[PDB]
Design an enzyme around this catalytic site. Structure first.
Site, PDB file in Angstrom:
ATOM      1  N   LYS A   7       0.787  -1.227   0.000  1.00  0.00           N
ATOM      2  CA  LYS A   7       0.000   0.000   0.000  1.00  0.00           C
ATOM      3  C   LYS A   7       0.825   1.285   0.000  1.00  0.00           C
ATOM      4  O   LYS A   7       2.005   1.307   0.361  1.00  0.00           O
ATOM      5  CB  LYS A   7      -0.992   0.016   1.170  1.00  0.00           C
ATOM      6  CG  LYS A   7      -2.218  -0.866   0.965  1.00  0.00           C
ATOM      7  CD  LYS A   7      -3.496  -0.092   1.256  1.00  0.00           C
ATOM      8  CE  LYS A   7      -4.731  -0.889   0.895  1.00  0.00           C
ATOM      9  NZ  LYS A   7      -4.863  -2.073   1.772  1.00  0.00           N
ATOM     10  N   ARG A  45      -3.937 -10.287   4.140  1.00  0.00           N
ATOM     11  CA  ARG A  45      -4.218 -10.273   2.713  1.00  0.00           C
ATOM     12  C   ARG A  45      -3.025  -9.680   1.962  1.00  0.00           C
ATOM     13  O   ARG A  45      -2.721  -8.493   2.118  1.00  0.00           O
ATOM     14  CB  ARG A  45      -5.465  -9.444   2.454  1.00  0.00           C
ATOM     15  CG  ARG A  45      -5.839  -9.350   0.989  1.00  0.00           C
ATOM     16  CD  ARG A  45      -7.097  -8.544   0.839  1.00  0.00           C
ATOM     17  NE  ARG A  45      -7.512  -8.393  -0.542  1.00  0.00           N
ATOM     18  CZ  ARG A  45      -7.049  -7.455  -1.360  1.00  0.00           C
ATOM     19  NH1 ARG A  45      -6.140  -6.594  -0.928  1.00  0.00           N
ATOM     20  NH2 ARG A  45      -7.491  -7.386  -2.608  1.00  0.00           N
TER      21      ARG A  45
HETATM   22  C1  LIG Z   1      -5.133  -6.091  -4.731  1.00  0.00           C
HETATM   23  O1  LIG Z   1      -5.463  -5.092  -3.845  1.00  0.00           O
HETATM   24  C2  LIG Z   1      -6.509  -4.434  -4.054  1.00  0.00           C
HETATM   25  O2  LIG Z   1      -7.316  -4.840  -4.934  1.00  0.00           O
HETATM   26  C3  LIG Z   1      -6.532  -3.013  -3.587  1.00  0.00           C
HETATM   27  C4  LIG Z   1      -7.796  -2.592  -2.893  1.00  0.00           C
HETATM   28  C5  LIG Z   1      -8.834  -2.170  -3.893  1.00  0.00           C
HETATM   29  C6  LIG Z   1      -8.394  -3.592  -1.919  1.00  0.00           C
HETATM   30  N1  LIG Z   1      -9.404  -4.327  -2.254  1.00  0.00           N
HETATM   31  N2  LIG Z   1      -9.988  -5.121  -1.335  1.00  0.00           N
HETATM   32  C7  LIG Z   1      -9.623  -5.271   0.037  1.00  0.00           C
HETATM   33  N3  LIG Z   1     -10.343  -6.132   0.814  1.00  0.00           N
HETATM   34  C8  LIG Z   1     -10.030  -6.302   2.168  1.00  0.00           C
HETATM   35  N4  LIG Z   1     -10.791  -7.177   2.993  1.00  0.00           N
HETATM   36  N5  LIG Z   1      -8.905  -5.529   2.709  1.00  0.00           N
HETATM   37  C9  LIG Z   1      -8.189  -4.649   1.878  1.00  0.00           C
HETATM   38  O3  LIG Z   1      -7.166  -3.903   2.422  1.00  0.00           O
HETATM   39  C10 LIG Z   1      -8.567  -4.518   0.486  1.00  0.00           C
HETATM   40  C11 LIG Z   1      -7.901  -3.622  -0.523  1.00  0.00           C
HETATM   41  O4  LIG Z   1      -6.802  -2.877  -0.192  1.00  0.00           O
END
Ligand SMILES: COC(=O)C[C@@H](C)c1n[nH]c2nc(N)[nH]c(=O)c2c1=O
Ligand SMILES: COC(=O)C[C@@H](C)c1n[nH]c2nc(N)[nH]c(=O)c2c1=O
Ligand SMILES: N[C@@H](CCCC[NH3+])C(=O)O
Ligand SMILES: N[C@@H](CCCC[NH3+])C(=O)O
Lengths: 263, 263
Positions: free
Chosen positions: A210, A244
């Protein structure tokens, strides 16, 4: 600590034995295509398999309409689920996309809007009886007390979820690092992450590569493995049950070592 | 937290602004040579420069007699100190080696035996007025209470140091991970590292690529960057002021990110 297992249909996840790794799937779409093309879906499948081989416990799959979002994501979930024996989460905040994805074979819902953008998604979740990740989000950075506000906000999502029939055991929380927070606020949320624990639900951390890491280190997205690593380690120390991540190999190792140390 | 700076002659180290990185120098010696050869010393110098360029704040330099140990190490300290503007520590537990190394230009003493193998080293330290790192060590693993024993043991070193004239401000402690401890004991010491803090001295952590990391991850020495990373992050969370590492680039980044997060 956890008297229950995350039940994910055919797969069961134990919240106690180790930090669970959620791999982030590449969704690089084909031009010319609405979705389901051989290149798209095969690239997707191969990545899921790699992440599986690198220690991923969940595969996370997710402008643009709902009709399309489904045509894009559904073929991927169908293929990955058949070919990768690993629970799948759909990264969406749309009730209908979540519904389609689960019919396709997704096991977990992953809502970056914590059920506030489309409360009906909580009804989808209740109905299908799948775990749902409620992430902290908002359309402003106008806090009075970051952590207190966050906890209030998350708790507003817990209310929507439980009001819709979502069992406590199907609830997971996410601090929403990188969302609706200044760089300084993201660091502050990291520093005080352990406070989410009082809410009594498993916590997933999502900090991979990030912008705030780039902001501390002053390094581009592809140079953020060490920063991600730090955030993952800190997060595990502070009690998070999932992380994640993009770099599944590296983060699995750091997680495993953290697990060993914090006993 | 620290009302004083580590004074290292021409260099001063601030214990408050960031975790300090101690780079571990390659000492690959020349066969045929007693020491000081162009290949040995140039390889050494180049590595020190690299580590400097990668974010190292200290350069750590260190069977075999005392006469020899000196012929080996002295040329390296002389060259590195002239050519790398960075404080140098001599990794030895021998009073005479420490004496020679400081005359050569080393700024800090680094005793893996915490002044118990050659108490006269504490007198060298007092005399030259240089910081000394006292590491926890012993010739057995026969503990009754690991952490309590460790603290007692370290404190026995503090006594030798202070009895010799060593000012409190010239004292640094090291848990001695990987020494006189079973794998399980090393993990336990990591888990409870914050306890060293009550002793009131800066703490240096030295876990780089160690066997216990290989034992958790089941990976060889060259595959231990992620494990080292974890231990470094945990260590920083638990209040350590230095980390002694091989992978200076990577660990500097993880340290810097940890610093930012723990504020
Ligand atoms: C590949 O990374 C992304 O797609 C970036 C963003 C859009 C993102 N999507 N969904 C997420 N979902 C959960 N639970 N926690 C997150 O920090 C997160 C994200 O940071
Ligand atoms: C390149 O690494 C080594 O040379 C391995 C051993 C011998 C070693 N030497 N000195 C040390 N000194 C302090 N202060 N803390 C340590 O953990 C440590 C060690 O682990
Ligand atoms: N140290 C714990 C890890 C549990 C999961 C930590 N997030 C066992 O072993
Ligand atoms: N967060 C602190 C770091 C001090 C050094 C930590 N070992 C400042 O900034």
């Amino acid at each position: 600590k956890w008297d229950y297992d995350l039940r994910c249909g055919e797969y069961t996840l134990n919240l106690n034995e180790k930090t669970l790794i959620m791999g982030i799937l590449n969704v690089t779409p084909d031009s010319f295509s609405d979705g389901g093309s051989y290149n798209e879906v095969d690239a997707a499948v191969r990545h899921a398999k790699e992440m599986r081989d690198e220690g991923a416990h969940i595969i996370d799959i997710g402008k643009v309409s709902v009709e399309e979002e489904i045509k894009r994501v559904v073929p991927m979930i169908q293929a990955v689920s058949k070919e990768v024996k690993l629970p799948i989460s759909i990264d969406t905040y749309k009730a209908e996309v979540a519904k389609q994805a689960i019919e396709a074979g997704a096991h977990i819902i992953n809502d970056i809007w914590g059920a506030k953008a489309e409360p009906k998604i909580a009804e989808v979740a209740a109905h299908y009886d799948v775990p749902i990740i409620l992430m902290h989000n908002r359309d402003n950075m106008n806090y009075r007390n970051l952590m207190a506000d966050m906890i209030a906000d998350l708790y507003d999502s817990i209310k929507i979820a439980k009001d819709a029939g979502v069992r406590d055991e199907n609830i997971i929380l996410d601090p929403g690092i990188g969302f609706a927070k200044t760089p300084e606020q993201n660091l502050e949320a990291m520093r005080n992450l352990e406070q989410l624990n009082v809410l009594g639900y498993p916590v997933l951390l999502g900090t991979s590569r990030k912008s705030f890491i780039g902001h501390v280190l002053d390094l581009p997205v592809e140079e953020r493995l060490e920063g991600t690593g730090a955030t993952v380690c800190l997060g595990i120390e502070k009690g998070c049950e999932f992380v994640r991540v993009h770099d599944v190999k590296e983060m699995s190792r750091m997680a495993k070592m953290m697990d060993a140390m914090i006993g």
